[PDB]
């Protein structure tokens, strides 16, 4: 039976990979950073409170100018805000109300949406007339869309619930490349600053790093014990953080191909919805199911502070490009900016 | 403030009033989720998910069929927390067919749906179909193949009563949700009338609990 031989070879390869990972481990980052100054205490206040949504907020994104942001909600609306003055620039009504992801184009021209309808839509903001119209409706997935991100004005990358991630061409409208190899639903995506690689985290408790040009999987990280819900890169493009339902964030390194540090407290028994970094990566923000956010020290694994004030589950948060503010969205239909 | 700033504030106020009007219009709809394991004909017609909109006696309905979403439920069930009710369809003549037993699988799915943590106060509408075929074929095969411990009369009415009891006796915490049962037909829009009655009862309870007197 060739199946038994293939399984034995795969087990041998996994054992060799584990042995190499163990041999590559010399010292721990905790031991290295045990002699660094701790962050004292962080007390941010709600500078702004954006209102106007009528249902649970599922996603949000920041503009490159660090002033304009887009929000997605289950009432079939897509609002672009002015963070400084709490003004609304646009209100886009969608065809399907079951939206679960949103993106803002790096050029500021287009926006995107997706959800349970298997179709990723694209909208055009700057037109000769005074309204926003649909420019394209991409189809070709079999399960729901979880995450969508822009590479340029002509390329988009999406992740689906049928164990596949695809790269699309907006002008043509067809799938240029399809990445396969997962086992369960894919939930989160994150793009590197060089825009040449990206990582995905699925429900089989695994992490996969892809290459856009070649179209293949490079490395596999397996440390978790349950579902994985969120991903986010380190600014330098050599590490990323993961959120899971076992009440544990984790940090992985691309060069060492091993798990570095874990975060866990005996008072945390909930899940993790969103994870983001600061500009320098010293402070790590994670949204929890217990109605408030936690600020973690990325180099000493200590609890710096708590950003409380949300009356329901926080499902999304992000930091500006200049590191000047953060904004958290929650199921209580509110957005708050903290400085 | 300058001229352009004042004009921007005016635009924002217009957007506000449009959003408020849209929300006020949309708050008065009835949302239903359709599930099954069993034939959606006469219940949905009479990729992704399918919308279905209709009006019956001055009420706007939205029926969502999610039969084509073959993925892990536990990661998109929570979108349907605020649905008004659930419609559940069961085949009544699949007791003697192996996929395990079809009706055993139906019971397992019903238990998992009813004992979910997001549906502690959601009414369940139960439709049983193919009653004519079940009555035709009840005489040629006994009921011991599925439930060995029946020990009773082998007639259509008794079998239907036993099945209804078996399906109604699986709701733990039977203090916050009510399960309705019906035998489907094809005359006088009786199915739509039944759905209308169920949603009317649920709406009355929800208004009572929202006004804070119960």
């Amino acid at each position, epitope marked *: 039976s060739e199946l038994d031989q293939l399984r034995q070879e795969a087990e041998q390869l996994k054992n060799q990979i584990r042995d190499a990972r163990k041999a590559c481990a010399d010292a721990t980052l905790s031991q290295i950073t045990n002699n660094i100054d701790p962050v004292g205490r962080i007390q941010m206040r709600t500078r702004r409170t954006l209102r106007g949504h009528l249902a649970k907020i599922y996603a949000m994104h920041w503009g490159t100018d660090s002033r*304009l942001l887009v929000s997605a909600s289950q009432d079939g609306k897509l609002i672009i805000w*002015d963070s400084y003055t709490t*003004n609304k*620039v646009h209100a886009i009504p969608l065809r399907s109300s079951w939206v679960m992801t949103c993106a803002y184009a790096p050029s500021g021209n287009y926006v995107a949406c997706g959800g349970l309808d298997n179709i990723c839509s694209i909208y055009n903001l700057k037109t*000769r*007339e*005074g*309204n926003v119209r649909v420019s394209r409706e991409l189809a070709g997935h079999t399960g729901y869309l979880s995450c969508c991100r822009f590479l340029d004005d002509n390329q988009i990358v999406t992740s689906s619930g049928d164990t596949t991630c695809a790269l699309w061409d907006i002008e043509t409208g067809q799938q240029t490349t399809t990445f396969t190899g997962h086992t369960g639903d894919v939930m989160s995506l994150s793009l590197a600053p060089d825009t040449r690689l990206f990582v995905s985290g699925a429900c089989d408790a695994s992490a996969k790093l892809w290459d856009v040009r070649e179209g293949m999987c490079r490395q596999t990280f397996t440390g978790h014990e349950s579902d994985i819900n969120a991903i986010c890169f380190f600014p330098n493009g050599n590490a990323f953080a993961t959120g899971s339902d076992d009440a544990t964030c984790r940090l992985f390194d691309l060069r060492a191909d091993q798990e570095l540090m874990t975060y866990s407290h005996d008072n945390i028994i909930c899940g993790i919805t969103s994870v983001s970094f600061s500009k320098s990566g010293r402070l790590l923000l994670a949204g929890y199911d217990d109605f408030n956010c936690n600020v973690w020290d990325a180099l000493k694994a200590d609890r710096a502070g708590v950003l409380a004030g949300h009356d329901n589950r926080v499902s999304c948060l992000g930091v500006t490009d200049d590191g000047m503010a953060v904004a958290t969205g929650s199921w209580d239909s509110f957005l708050k900016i903290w400085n | 403030l*300058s*001229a*352009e*700033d*004042k*004009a*921007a504030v*005016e*635009r924002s106020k*217009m957007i506000d009033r449009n959003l408020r009007e849209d929300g006020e219009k949309a708050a008065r709809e009835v949302k239903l989720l359709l599930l099954g394991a069993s034939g959606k004909n006469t219940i949905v017609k009479q990729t992704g998910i399918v919308e279905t909109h209709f009006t019956f006696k001055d009420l706007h309905f939205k029926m969502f069929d999610v039969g084509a979403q073959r993925s892990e439920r536990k990661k998109w069930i929570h979108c349907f927390e605020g649905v008004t009710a659930i419609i559940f369809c069961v085949a009544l003549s699949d007791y003697d067919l192996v996929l395990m037993n079809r009706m055993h699988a139906s019971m397992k799915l019903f238990d998992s749906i009813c004992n979910n943590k997001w549906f502690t106060d959601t009414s369940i509408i139960l439709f049983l179909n193919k009653k004519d075929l079940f009555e035709e074929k009840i005489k040629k095969s006994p009921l011991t193949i599925c439930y060995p411990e029946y020990a009773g009369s082998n007639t259509y009415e008794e079998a239907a009563a036993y099945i209804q009891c078996q399906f109604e006796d699986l709701n733990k915490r039977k203090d916050t949700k009510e399960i309705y049962t019906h035998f489907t037909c094809s005359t006088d829009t009786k199915n739509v009338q039944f759905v209308f009655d169920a949603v009317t009862d649920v709406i009355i309870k929800n208004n009572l609990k929202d006004c804070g007197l119960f």
Partner: single-chain antibody
Amino acid sequence: VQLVESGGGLVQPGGSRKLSCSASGFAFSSFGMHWVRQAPEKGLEWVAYISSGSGTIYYADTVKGRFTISRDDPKNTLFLQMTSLRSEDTAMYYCVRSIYYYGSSPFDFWGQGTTLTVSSSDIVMTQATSSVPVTPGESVSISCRSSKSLLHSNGNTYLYWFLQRPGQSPQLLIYRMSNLASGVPDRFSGSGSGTAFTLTISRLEAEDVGVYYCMQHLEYPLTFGAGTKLEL
């Protein structure tokens, strides 16, 4: 996207006439509409303004009390009621659209123009340059001045540019400092600070002949300047 103006004619003093304009090719209801007239041999003068939602109506001192402005969104038609005519009303009337949000470009499009002949605390904008000859392939500079500095506390400067081709409606070139509108070649640049303004044309072509204009948008008397004429 086009604007057509209708009406006009010859009215004796003491009479009345109602100008009308029609629009097609864009979302009319979400725009604010202006009125601008031009004397037979003089510059451009601002008359009235109506906003989207009909919530803001601004007039001019010379025409206050004798003019009325209104719009009809369902019919895509604009009006300007006009009573108690005088001998200074002889001009050619225009119609301009304007939209306001963060990053928008007001005054982007211009109408055609109709002629009406009748038988018989304001910022001063100064631009003394006029009748300057031009040569193809050479750089040309146009200056402009104002009494009050145009730099607001929010970091903005509210100044505009317009180009009057021979026998044609004005075209918007630059709407604010260091900003080029759609359809403008990348050889027109505008810079300055405070009360000093300039416009740079690196290589002027044959279509670069006409009259240029300044405009302010700080508060709401609206003032233009005696245009600078460039001829080959």
